Amino acid sequence: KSKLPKPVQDLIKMIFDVESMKKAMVEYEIDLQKMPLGKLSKRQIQAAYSILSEVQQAVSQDSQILDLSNRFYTLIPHDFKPPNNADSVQAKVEMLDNLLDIEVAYSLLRGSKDPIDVNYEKLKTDIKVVDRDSEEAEIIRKYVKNTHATTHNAYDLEVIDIFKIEREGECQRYKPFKQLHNRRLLWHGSRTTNFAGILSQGLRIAPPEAPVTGYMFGKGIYFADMVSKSANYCHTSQGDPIGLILLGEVALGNMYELKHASHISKLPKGKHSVKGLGKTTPDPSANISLDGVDVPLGTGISSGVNDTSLLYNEYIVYDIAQVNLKYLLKLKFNFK
Ligand SMILES: Cn1ncnc1[C@H]1c2n[nH]c(=O)c3cc(F)cc(c23)N[C@@H]1c1ccc(F)cc1
Numbered sequence: 367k368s369k370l371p372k373p374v375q376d377l378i379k380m381i382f383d384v385e386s387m388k389k390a391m392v393e394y395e396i397d398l399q400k401m402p403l404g405k406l407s408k409r410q411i412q413a414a415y416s417i418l419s420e421v422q423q424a425v426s427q428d429s430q431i432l433d434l435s436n437r438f439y440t441l442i443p444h445d446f447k448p449p450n451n452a453d454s455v456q457a458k459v460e461m462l463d464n465l466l467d468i469e470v471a472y473s474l475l476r477g478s479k480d481p482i483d484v485n486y487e488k489l490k491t492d493i494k495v496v497d498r499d500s501e502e503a504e505i506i507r508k509y510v511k512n513t514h515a516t517t518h519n520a521y522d523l524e525v526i527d528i529f530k531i532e533r534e535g536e537c538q539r540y541k542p543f544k545q546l547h548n549r550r551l552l553w554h555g556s557r558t559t560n561f562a563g564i565l566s567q568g569l570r571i572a573p574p575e576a577p578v579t580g581y582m583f584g585k586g587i588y589f590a591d592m593v594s595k596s597a598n599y600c601h602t603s604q605g606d607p608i609g610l611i612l613l614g615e616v617a618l619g620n621m622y623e624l625k626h627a628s629h630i631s632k633l634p635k636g637k638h639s640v641k642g643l644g645k646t647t648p649d650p651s652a653n654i655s656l657d658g659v660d661v662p663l664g665t666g667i668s669s670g671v672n673d674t675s676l677l678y679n680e681y682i683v684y685d686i687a688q689v690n691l692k693y694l695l696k697l698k699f700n701f702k
Contacts, residue, residue, distance in 0.1 A: 368480040371495050373527040375482050377696065380608070381561045382475050382485050387468045390559055394461050400443035404476065406469040411462050414441045415575040418462075422455045422577050456580040463572075464557055471562035489565040490535075496528035496693070503528055505656050506613065506693060509551075509663040510593050513648050515678060516666065518594035519702065526608070526696040533568055539687040543617035546638065551661045551692065552589035552681055553596035554612040561610050561694075569614070569689050583640045584630035586682040587689055589616055591648050591662045595678045602699040613693035615659050616681060625674040633684060643671045644678035659692075 368375055387403055417438045424431045439448050442462075474488040486493070496503050506528050514523060543549075556564060572585045590596040593611070600609030619638030622630075630640060649664030669679075683689060 368482040368486075370483065370486060373495050373696070374486070374493050374529070377493065377527070377529065377694075378482050378486050378489075380558060380610075380696075381489070381565070382471065383559075384472070384475070386559050386606075387472060390464060390468060390557075394465075395444050395446060397443040397445040400445075403468070403472050406465055406472075408466070408469070410441060411466055411469075412573060412575045414438060414462055415459065415573065415577065417441060418455050418458055419575065419577045422452055422579055425450055425452060425455070452579050455577065459577055459580065462576075464559060467557070467560035467563035470566065471559060474562055474566060489562070490533065491565045492532040492534075493694070494530045496530050502530075502656070505654065505661060505663065506695065509613075509661060510695070510697075512652075512663050512665045513553075513592040513594070515592050515594045515646065517677060518592075518598065521597075521602070521607075521699040521701045523593060523597060524698040524700060526698050529694040529696075531565070531691055531694050533565060533691050536568060536690060540617075540690045543619075543688050543690075546617040546619045546688075548618045548621065549659050550589075550591070550616050550618055550681070551613055551656060551659045552591060552616050553593055554587070554589055554614055555596035555599035555609065556612075557599075557601055558606075558608070558610055564612070568686060568691070569612075570686060571684070578629055581629065582627045583624065583642060583680070583682045584628070584684075586630065586640070586684040587686065589614065589681040589683075590678065591681070592646075592666065592678045595680070597697065597699070600697070600699070602697075604701050607699045607701065609697050609699060611695050611697055612691055613695065615690040615692050616683060617688045617690075618681060618683070621681075625671060625676075627675065630682070630684060638683070638688065640682040642676050642680040642682070643669065643674050644676040644680070645669060645671060645674060646678055 569587045602609040621641040622637040623641045646666045647669035648662040649667045652664030654661050
């Protein structure tokens with residue numbers, strides 16, 4: 367019998383759900399016999415990324431293009447006829463990203479005591495419940511409620527549980543950025559099946575093999591100041607309407623503000639982050655400070671920037687150590 371609070375136990379079961387991993391694979395139409403959950407390998411996936419890079423290049427740039435599409439399907443077996451377009455190549459990339467974390471999740475799970483407590487320990491994260499009556503819960507609730515975008519109206523968000531999280535070794539890694547100017551509490555959403563990898567390894571940057579297309583500001587860690595922009599990356603459906611979103615303290619420092627896409631390979635010297643300027647910004651006057659970190663929880667208003675490719679802000683760091691994960695929210699998506 368696990369001594370852990372029931373919301374923490376429910377979180378572990380949700381993270382380490384094999385049925386969820388298998389369901390995701392069934393939806394991606396992967397052959398579960400030719401490519402079972404336990405046989406997905408990093409080497410196979412990284413090599414598939416490379417073929418998708420050799421593919422997106424031919425589309426950007428027919429015997430050798432079919433031979434590249436066919437060599438990909440040989441590498442990542444599917445069961446269908448097998449279906450140009452960088453958006454389809456980016457879908458395969460995202461599938462491979464989900465497949466990797468699905469592999470990590472299964473790897474931890476498979477690789478005396480209650481299975482819930484044993485699986486908790488594999489996450490190397492200290493997970494505590496934030497009380498509904500606390501000042502932190504109130505601030506977090508206000509942040510969810512106010513930063514829901516007017517354009518994003520496919521669902522309503524409801525906070526189920528708020529967890530305070532301490533990833534093992536992240537405190538040590540963060541130390542150089544601890545006193546940096548412009549530290550902000552920002553959103554990061556992901557598929558529930560990715561949270562085993564995120565808690566055990568932290569938020570990561572896409573490998574060099576992975577195609578850069580899709581990464582507007584290049585390969586880094588992306589954050590939003592509007593909950594609905596990050597909540598979309600949960601990919602919640604009416605079927606599975608419960609998602610997980612992070613609140614991270616991000617050491618932005620001096621921001622390289624951009625109004626359009628730019629594949630950052632090296633920031634301008636003296637700059638520590640990119641801020642993609644959006645048309646709508648959370649009201650800066652309502653900006654509060656939760657334990658010395660800026661919390662942009664104001665309601666969505668015009669930033670004045672009409673000359674931009676973005677509707678809402680996004681923040682990107684290019685060093686994993688600039689992120690200190692603080693909270694994990696369990697959100698109910700109530701679709702309209
Ligand atoms: C899909 N993905 N994989 C890693 N990071 C992400 C996204 C992302 N995840 N989560 C967020 O909360 C977020 C909040 C933003 F304002 C902006 C974001 C994100 N863009 C990231 C993005 C989008 C498309 C793409 F092709 C590559 C990267």
